[PDB]
Amino acid sequence: FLPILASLAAKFGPKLFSLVTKKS
Question: What is the disulfide pattern of this chain?
């Protein structure tokens, strides 16, 4: 399989990742 929560977060809200993981 693949990590569903990460895919859902990437489709809906890559805004949250952009706020936290600014280095990477």
Answer: 18-24
Contacts of 9 (CB under 8 A, 6+ apart): 16, 17
Identify the experimental approach. NMR
* 9 burial type by CB count under 10 A (0-12 exposed, 13-18 middle, 19+ buried): middle
Other CB atoms within 10 A of residue 15 CB: 8
CB-CB contact of 9 with 16 (8 Å): yes
Element (H, E) at 14: helix 14-20
